[PDB]
């Protein structure tokens, strides 16, 4: 007696480097106007969060989907799936979402993570989360009116966390460059928000940019290799204000078969959602001594 | 007493950063020597064969690149304690026969109680350096007149330079009276009694102090409308600590302030730490962007 819901992927806005923010109208229609939309990555999962016309959660219409870029000209297709609380697929079963007629609000999360007691998701450091963002018009939450089957056109989603990337190049005298099991440890970042603090995500609440601490850390254990023998390591970090504090970055690398450790102490940092904080480091041999040199672009606003 | 006619040996200018086996004969081997700048002063510091100060043979000279070759000529002069000429009334140097050690300073600053000169931030000092063979202290044996060939001199402080470019939407870019203020650099006021310059002591690379600061009020303009500001800074260990650069600029007629926080820096004598900062308009908002270049060593 209901209606089958066929959701159509809207893609995502990938993470970009910082540049001075649009201090304008909430919601912002100008920040993403010239931003390209990428296809949702093949094998990723999305959670469809349904609300009634009064913006109240409808747990019964909560559905998870598996992405397969199997459409016309490599387009994305969404397959009903069953996931764990972290959004990883656990079973085969493809049960379609059937809904009654009416007007509903809907939000998206990727990975298809489980909703907590406060109506949002549990998110720490060392993870990415694409979702509905009320900060921009392009990604803002939409309503659908349901009248056999109906096509649900999904708006594009955007990153809720910051991203840090380290490219480590093999410089003068470096023949072999690998990651140690200890990898890259980022320290002095935001400690993840408590489950006792209220967050009304459906009405526009977003992760705060509060002061990080000496005890919160994240470890990157995996890196990819470029043709030039350089390593690329990346991770998600929660939005954190460390403008008055330091963020230490410890790189544990195996240079020419010997274990080494290098520390980058980074002061004056404002890590925000949807941005990449890219670093390019080079391991060199000066005499017999191994050094790490790095470079990175920095942006600061007028204080006056 | 023999008349001393000193002949300028030039100087090794400040370069961008790029080991230890003292004295080092390899660091400066392919480095070019510049002529001492016209109007600058040099102070001659004389010691006996046992390396004891001879205050009576202390002399200051004024540089004039008037030499029959295009060379620097040294004219006896009278200076203030900061090395500025107060009179160019030339009284030549006359010395008795024997063996003497000699050191050079530029500007011709006055020697303090410890036998060195008072140096702070916001100044350059060229001098004799025992760290390199080319600039190391020499002895002279005096036997009517004698020509004293001076070895080249080199910088005792670090140098910082900021090039501020006029980026997208920037029509006018000037310095405010507040200019560029650098803090978190070595404290000149943190005194050492343990300074024996004649036997090879050099300025320590101390951890900086936020209380220690310097202000650049003057800048030059490049053809592309960019500004160039620079200053001397005493050797600073900003590897684990930061240097703060506050740039007070007038962008398109409005006063602005930007903070650069720099880290992973070991600022040493004779080196230039150069920054290229661009003032941009993103929407209506003005930003400053630059590139960090840091280095760190293996701890293992
Ligand atoms: Cl963004
Ligand atoms: Cl200089
Ligand atoms: Cl040098």
Return the HEC string of A26-93: CCECCCCCCCCCECCCCCCEEEEEEECCCCCECHHHCEEEEEECCCCCCCCEEEEEEECCCCCEEECC
Task: Report which DSSP code applies to B169.
Answer: T
Cβ-count burial of B35 within 10 angstroms (0-12 exposed, 13-18 middle, 19+ buried)?
A: middle
CA angle A261, A265, A268 (to 5 degrees): 160
Picking from B267, B259, B254, the residue whose alpha carbon sits closest to that of residue B293 is: B267
What residues have CB less than 8 Å from B231, skipping those under 6 apart? B121, B122, B159, B160, B182, B214, B216
> Using a CB-CB distance cutoff of 8 angstroms, which residues of chain B are in contact with residue A188?
none
Question: Which residues of chain A are within 8 Å of residue B240 when distances are taken between CB atoms?
Answer: 265
Q: Which CATH architecture has domain B159-300?
A: Sandwich (2.60)
Q: Report chain B's C-alpha Rg in angstroms.
A: 22
CB contact under 8 A, B294 and A297: no
CA A32 to centroid of ligand 1, rounded, Å:
7
d(CA B226, CA A117) in angstroms, rounded, equals 56
Q: Where in chain A is the domain with CATH 2.60.40.3740?
A: 163-304
Q: Show Cβ contacts of residue B254 under 8 Å, excluding neighbours closer than 6 positions.
A: none
Q: How far is the CA of B27 from the centre of ligand 3 (A)?
A: 7
For ligand 3, the distance from its centroid to the CA atom of residue A258, given in whole angstroms, is 32
DSSP string for residues in B91-156? --EEE-SEEEEEEEEES-PPB-TTSSB---SS---EE--TTBTTTS-EEEEE--EEEEEPPPEEES
- Residues A12/A67, Cβ–Cβ less than 8 Å: no
∠A121-A127-A132 over CA atoms, to 5°?
50
**Beta-strand relationship, A12-13 and A3-8:** unpaired
First to last CA, chain A: 63
User: What distance in Å separates the CA atoms of residue A7 and residue A40, rounded to the nearest whole number?
Assistant: 13
Which DSSP category does A96 fall into?
-
Burial A164-173 (b: 16+ CB within 10 A, else e): bebbbbbbee
Q: Is the dihedral of CA A109, A110, A112, A115 positive or negative?
A: negative
The DSSP code sequence of A104-138 is: EEEEEEES-PPB-TTSSB---SS---EE--TTBTT
Chain B from 220 to 279: CB within 8 A of any A CB: 240, 242, 255-261, 263-264
Rounded to the nearest angstrom, the gap between the alpha carbon of residue A280 and the centroid of all alpha carbons in its chain is: 21
CATH 2.60.40.3730 domain range(s) in chain B: 1-158
- Which regions of chain B carry the CATH code 2.60.40.3740? 159-300
Tell me which DSSP letter residue A214 carries.
Answer: T
Elucidated via: X-ray
Query: A1-162: which CATH topology?
Result: Immunoglobulin-like (2.60.40)
* Chain A residues in contact with B255 (beta carbon < 8 A): 304
* CA–CA gap between residue B197 and residue B103 (Å, rounded): 10
Which element (helix H / strand E) includes A246? strand A240-255
* CA pair distance A130, A246, nearest whole angstrom: 27
- The answer to whether the CB of A120 falls within 8 A of the CB of A201 is yes
Q: What are phi and psi of A59, to 5 degrees?
A: -45, -35
Chain A residues closer than 8 Å to B296 by CB: 262-264, 291-292, 294
CATH of A163-304, one of 3.90.420.10, 3.30.429.10, 2.60.40.3740, 3.30.200.20: 2.60.40.3740
Nearest to A292 among B19, B288, B296 (CB): B296
User: Resolution limit in angstroms?
Assistant: 2.6
Which part of chain A is CATH 2.60.40.3730? 1-162
Who among B290, B295, B300 is closest to A259 (CB)? Answer: B300
* SS3 assignment, position B262: strand
Which of A283, A292, A302 to substitute to test the interface with B, most B CBs within 10 Å?
Answer: A302
Interval between CA B148 and ligand 1 midpoint (Å): 68
| Cα radius of gyration rounded to whole Å, chain A | 22
**Is residue A304 less than 8 Å (CB to CB) from chain B?**
yes
- Helix (H), strand (E) at residue A140: none
Task: Encode burial over B182-194: b for 16+ CB neighbours within 10 A, e otherwise.
Answer: bbbbbbbeeeeee
> For residue A1, how far is its CA from the centre of ligand 1 (angstroms)?
42
β pairing state of A240-255 and A177-187: antiparallel
**Fold for the domain defined by B1-158:** Immunoglobulin-like (2.60.40)
Chain-centroid distance, C-alpha B195: 19
């Amino acid at each position: 007696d209901r209606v089958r819901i066929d959701p159509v992927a809207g893609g995502y806005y990938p993470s970009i480097s910082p540049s001075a923010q649009t201090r304008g109208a909430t919601p912002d229609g100008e920040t993403l106007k010239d931003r390209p939309i990428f296809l949702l990555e093949d094998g990723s999962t999305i959670r469809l969060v349904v609300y009634d016309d009064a913006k109240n959660l409808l747990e019964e219409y909560s559905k998870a989907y598996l992405v397969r870029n199997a459409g016309t000209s490599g387009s994305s297709l969404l397959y009903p799936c069953e996931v764990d609380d972290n959004g990883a697929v656990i079973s085969s079963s493809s049960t379609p979402l059937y809904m009654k007629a009416g007007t509903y609000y809907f939000r998206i999360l990727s990975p298809a993570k489980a909703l907590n007691s406060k109506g949002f998701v549990n998110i720490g450091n060392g993870e990415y989360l694409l979702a509905t963002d009320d900060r921009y018009t392009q990604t803002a939450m939409t309503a659908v009116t349901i009248t056999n089957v109906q096509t649900l056109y999904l708006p594009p989603i955007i990153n809720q966390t910051a991203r840090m990337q380290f490219t480590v190049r093999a410089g003068e005298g470096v023949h072999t460059l690998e990651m140690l099991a200890e990898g890259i440890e980022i320290s002095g970042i935001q400690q993840p928000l408590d489950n006792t603090t209220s967050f009304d995500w459906v009405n526009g609440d977003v992760l705060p940019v509060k002061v990080g601490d000496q005890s919160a850390s994240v470890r990157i254990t995996q890196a990819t290799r470029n043709a030039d023998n350089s390593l690329v390591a990346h991770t998600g970090v929660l939005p954190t204000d460390a403008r008055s504090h330091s963020i230490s970055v410890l790189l544990n690398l195996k240079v020419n078969g010997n274990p080494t450790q290098y520390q980058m102490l980074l002061t004056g940092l404002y890590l925000t959602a949807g941005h990449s904080y890219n670093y390019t480091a080079t391991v060199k041999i000066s005499n017999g001594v191994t050094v790490l040199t790095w470079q990175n672009r920095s942006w600061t606003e007028n204080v006056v």
